Amino acid sequence: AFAVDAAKAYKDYLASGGQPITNCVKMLCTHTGTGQAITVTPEANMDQESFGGASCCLYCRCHIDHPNPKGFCDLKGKYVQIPTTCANDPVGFTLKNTVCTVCGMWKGYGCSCDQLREPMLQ
Amino acid sequence: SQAWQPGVAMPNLYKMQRMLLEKCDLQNYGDSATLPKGIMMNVAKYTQLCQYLNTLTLAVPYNMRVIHFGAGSDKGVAPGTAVLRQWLPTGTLLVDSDLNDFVSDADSTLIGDCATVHTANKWDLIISDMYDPKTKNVTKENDSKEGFFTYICGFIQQKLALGGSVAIKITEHSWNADLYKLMGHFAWWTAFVTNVNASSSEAFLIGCNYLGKPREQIDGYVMHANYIFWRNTNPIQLSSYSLFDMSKFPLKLRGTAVMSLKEGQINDMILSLLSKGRLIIRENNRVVISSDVLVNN
Ligand SMILES: Nc1ncnc2c1ncn2[C@@H]1O[C@H](CSCC[C@H](N)C(=O)O)[C@@H](O)[C@H]1O
Ligand code: NA
Ligand SMILES: [Zn+2]
Ligand SMILES: [Zn+2]
């Protein structure tokens, strides 16, 4: 049953005061993108920074299996949009956050699927 | 004036001179461009290279095949590969390689000496940033270098589709006479210097539209001396200005035609289409690559 849990190990490491994983590859972009979480090309808006996905994935960076039967990675080969207030730790952000399966925005950082129905606009 | 360009291409008149080789002494050697916040030098460098490649007649078929040599960094990631994948159309196949292990956004990554890399298929674009660490730590008579450059020359002559292009990184000391001679096998070529790294003797030898045969006989030792003469006499101002406007960065998907023509069917009309970036000649078989593994106890 034994299984290494790198996710909780990185969260505990940060909680203690450990320096977040560095050298995440930040991309040059217009910052006029859709703001979606994971995209085929940089889609950062004015409140985000776009990074190469593989460099922001704990499993890719630590050279360890991905936590899913197929061993598939959702970041590798794509671009991840990280809020500027969290761009100092992109690996930690992708771990602690979830992409909305409906709008493609991060939960709590873009997804508005739970807000009230705006009085309809003409 | 050139400060707002992504970099500077060697003027054509230098290709027709017969300069004697000597030290590359750059006037702007002790300068640095203002890198945008949190942007690595290699992201800036590849972004300017891609900005310049956008101005050339690159063949861009659907299902484009790109191979990137020297893609690893001492950081354990692939900044250049991330820029190439941002630049290339979404359906483009990207394979990268390096002597050292690294994490990449490429479709496939091969670790080991490029000499161990094999492939049954032809490629549409070859990018190389390979540079031997000894070239730096050890200085000696500036003769043609024959390590990974011999592999690149063989790879261009056997695995590059006609109409395909290359961007091979060279420096004052990291260069090869046979590679310059092969530039004569392309419809057009140049030495491109990125404005962010203009304080370095570094340049990308760009071969545009491979013809599989020499349109011009080039003496590699003389052409490298011509390149050094240009770098020594035309100072390039360090500049990061082109990095702030990424609106027209993506390579336009031209949908260039791919045909599996024979060597006896390559007439003057075909060479003319290849020379305009309007044709790619190669089969479209399943892309298969591998890295040799030395076995020993
Ligand atoms: N014979 C060879 N085969 C493969 N890679 C080689 C090589 N000689 C040198 N290299 C690689 O060339 C690289 C030069 S540094 C490359 C930086 C990288 N392009 C980036 O985007 O940051 C080194 O990683 C080195 O390992
Ligand atoms: Na792209
Ligand atoms: Zn991963
Ligand atoms: Zn949502």
Residue numbers in the entry:
A (entry chain B): 4271 to 4392
B (entry chain A): 6800 to 7096
From the paper:
To facilitate structure-based drug design, we conducted an X-ray crystallographic study of the SARS-CoV-2 nsp16-nsp10 2′-O-methyltransferase complex, which methylates Cap-0 viral mRNAs to improve viral protein translation and to avoid host immune detection. Nsp16 is a 7-methylguanine-triphosphate-adenosine (m7GpppA)-specific, SAM-dependent 2′-O-MTase that is activated upon binding to nsp10 (16, 19). However, the main known function of nsp10 is the stabilization of the SAM binding pockets of nsp16 and nsp14 (19).
The structures of the heterodimer were determined in complex with the methyl donor SAM, the product of the reaction (S-adenosylhomocysteine, SAH), and pan-methyltransferase inhibitor sinefungin (SFG). The nsp16 protein catalyzes the transfer of the methyl group from SAM to the Cap-0, generating the reaction products SAH and Cap-1. Notably, SAH and SFG interact with the same residues as SAM without modifications in the site or the overall structure. Thus, the heterodimer is the most soluble and stable form of the 2-O-MTase complex, and the dimer of dimers in the large unit cell formed as a result of crystal packing.
